[PDB]
Subunit: 401 residues, 3 copies
Amino acid sequence: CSFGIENTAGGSAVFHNYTRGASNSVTKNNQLLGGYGSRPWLGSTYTEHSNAALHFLGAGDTSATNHGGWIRLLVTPKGKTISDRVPAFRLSDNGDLWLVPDGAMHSDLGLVRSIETLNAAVPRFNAPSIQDGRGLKIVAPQAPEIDLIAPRGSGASAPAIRAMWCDGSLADTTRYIGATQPGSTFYIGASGHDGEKFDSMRGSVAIKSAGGWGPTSTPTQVVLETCESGSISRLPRWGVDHNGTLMPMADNRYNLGWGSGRVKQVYAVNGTINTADARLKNDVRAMSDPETEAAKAIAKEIGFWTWKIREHCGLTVQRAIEIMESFGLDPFKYGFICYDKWDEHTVVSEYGPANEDGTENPIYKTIPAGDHYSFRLEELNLFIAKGFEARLSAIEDKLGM
Amino acid sequence: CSFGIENTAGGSAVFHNYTRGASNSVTKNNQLLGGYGSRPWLGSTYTEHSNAALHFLGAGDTSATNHGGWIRLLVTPKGKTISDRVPAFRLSDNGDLWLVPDGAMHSDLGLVRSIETLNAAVPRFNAPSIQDGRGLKIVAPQAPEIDLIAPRGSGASAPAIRAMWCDGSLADTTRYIGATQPGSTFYIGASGHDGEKFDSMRGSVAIKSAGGWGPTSTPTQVVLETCESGSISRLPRWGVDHNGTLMPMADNRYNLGWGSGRVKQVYAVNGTINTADARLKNDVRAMSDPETEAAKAIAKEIGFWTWKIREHCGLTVQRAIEIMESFGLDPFKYGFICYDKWDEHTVVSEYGPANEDGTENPIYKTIPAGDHYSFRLEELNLFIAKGFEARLSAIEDKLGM
Amino acid sequence: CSFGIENTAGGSAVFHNYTRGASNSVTKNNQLLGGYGSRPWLGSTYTEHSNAALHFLGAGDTSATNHGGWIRLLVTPKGKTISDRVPAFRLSDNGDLWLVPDGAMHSDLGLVRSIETLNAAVPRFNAPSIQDGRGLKIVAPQAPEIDLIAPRGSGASAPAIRAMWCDGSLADTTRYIGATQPGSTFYIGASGHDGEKFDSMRGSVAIKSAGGWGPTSTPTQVVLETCESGSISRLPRWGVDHNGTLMPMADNRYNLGWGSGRVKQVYAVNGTINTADARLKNDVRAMSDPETEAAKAIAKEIGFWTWKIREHCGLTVQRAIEIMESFGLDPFKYGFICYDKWDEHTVVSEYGPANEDGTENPIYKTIPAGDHYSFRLEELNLFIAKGFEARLSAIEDKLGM
């Protein structure tokens, strides 16, 4: 039944495991320094090893400068024997916790306790060891996961992942803690192996302080970052600013939509602001006579059309192209006529239902290669307008007006 | 004071718990196979059970094919007795870690160690058991949470959640690791009970590889996904591409803004590109005489207005509607005249300060029902322009030009 | 070798630590109630304290109403002695798990087991204690982190963080579980110290239920939220709705782009919808003669320009400004002429490669102060159009038409 150690005097009641190296030498790296474990009864014998256990192990060979030690907990899956038991919890000597469930690592890697030791055991892995000592690492086949199960009760289901930024340190005698500083960030993103190693994140969401904080001001922003094909460095692309503006994170560089991914429409209050600054342009030349002629002819093409229930006003780019060429102009040297083309490509179209193999089941779809003819209607309207101006000036001269 | 087991020869110093079933039968499922626990002193006695403890338990009845075993750690909240102690840490036999703090589960569920065993104990729960063996599960009343506390020291507060994608396996007899493959994703999202069960995520942010990776190319994208009312399958909606484009994830399907959520304004460098492709349209018919007449009359309505202060150029939709109808036209059959209506609805307007009941405190607001009359100004300009064209052609004929 | 406790009768085989206060008084808050620990061999002695250990400790002074107790696990980093061992795993009496790796907290704080106890030990910290009992807390210098290592095997690398919403409770006798309710949210965001305390999140991504759920309907939305300079309350800014619309979360409040962060261009199918509602405007006045005169003159400026290879149609704002002023008008009282200026500011331009000090290495860049002259081309076209209308009416009167 019950075995116990008692100290009646007010001191500690503690159990110790004492272990040596061979022939009184120092204890070694990964040597089992101590253990506690259950052995269940099979009917007439106990198991030969523990089915659940706590192990104390060495971290490096013991010496006057190294007393390194780490911990793991071992479990045995239902339906398996102690030959297939799993060191699923490993508390590294650096203080990190590794969670390595059944199926994640071969039993040859049962002594891995860090990125450094994992790199050594799997030479091609090459993850950054600067990530050691930072907290929790989960290794699982395919889909390592954190589930936050949140019953509402009488309030709200509101799971959360919360960074807590501050100035200062909990590591010294002083323990100053102060206001969040500029450059405070929280990245939620993905690193990956590139064929040679893992490195920095190449895609992420980042919540950032937008300046230093004070009791009346705690500004932030949220930024989405991606890495381009043929490149190995991620860039901030789009973000929401402290004032709520949704903006590209570089000027005159990123689009909204593309040929095979067009916005259906925009609801705005004010008109789009387009820069038309003399300092960024060459001189504005007058239109040639063929250009003016084409401008006049294009105005005659304006009518009404439908798609394949309302009547839309305008013309086709193909019609404008024929008119342009009939006056000897190359239509694609003009900014109001656009052509976009794209290759065949595959996209996630939807998600299947959860099944026996996983909960997240993307359904793929192939988008055929294609192309579009398009206008910039603001610039087209101005082209047409110059046509009207030339026609009006010709009339005004004929009436000495 | 101090109790110890010593092995001087270089072997292990290990403690074992040996337990049987009743009458020498096999140990049973959830049977306590071993235990270590503290019992504090009340003045003249010790507590009847341990206030903090490590338990080794069976996972399934022991047999020649099952040596299953799992672990939990128990703690007792300050201000409570050992009747209310909490098995807060449960290392499942599958290797998952369950964190179940005080107030999360009734004591009847102290032996729950998996989604399978939780489903059996709570028949209406019905979570997917495919999620077992994947890592960490946290159960807490209302707001299970992970906090990443990040003192700056002399650097930057930069907490991070990092997926680490790779090809290969750590699980086999030979380990192999290679470059991130196509279809690599990282989902941060929410599943929920639908009245019958939990299933796949129905809203999420997803970081994805955009193609396979190599040492000179590690492309990614970030995608936001939601599920529609009346639907049970989430779809990618908007995303930032590897090249930084912000785009809808299906063509000609999603809007920017709506009637009661209009963008204030857009800053663009180039003019909006609108597709005007003959292949997607029916034939462009000429304008009837009433339509041309309305186009001419509408041009006379252009003046300057202010809101209720710069002078803006244009006219009202209501004025255009009267003119349209005065020539016997239904104005709402034309694409340049729009009407939007919305019901009364309630939204989160802001967040209150943290209080004794929670840190996240949304303040609600009711938006009244309403409607708007709107133009598509690009189309309207073209309608007006055809009016000018007809007037110019009528003049040119009268002067034999 | 092997030390063991055996129970042949079918009962438990358990080890107990029995400890008292001084002079038979009750055990005290944070008193070591029990311990298990390895002591490695240095060559001729063992270490004076354990290099790896499990400790059971008191939570509050023991009494008839308090049997509080908690657990920690201690490890010793390779290259250090037991003077510098780390209580890296602390399972609080409330059931929370604290991960505190090497370098995170001074050894004086080794008994911290909660936000309440941390606040008392570090008076300036002032985090919200309502966060106690919610799950996992990770403290690390600068960059606490969670890594999800996901080898593809034969499937896909698909790590996930998954909130699981439901109605009900697992905490009571009743244990009702039901459908996800309205107001269910999942926040991924950042709190921070403001100089006095930590509080609510001030920037975040939030996945939210958009209404209650049922077996045929599980709507969601994704929202990005930030806090403004000079403010201490975060607001929803932009979101993707259940129907996939990307929208500002308040009407007529937020922009897309700004002067130093302009969208390059927009790809839309339909024309931008601009509200032009008589009910929201003052009366549309007719143009004065100087305004009409300027409108006519501006049409003559339309030609072609290039940036510093295609020919773009239009004119400069500076040219329009001179014409406006030549007829005695203030050009900046008119909505189609815009001027924006911005101060010098610093932004993250790029991410450096991973180095020995960290994986996430932002490279900064200074954007000089600057300004732009811009048009609203839709409004400008209408201004020009009125010029044409006045010219046509003058001709028609002269020919008695």
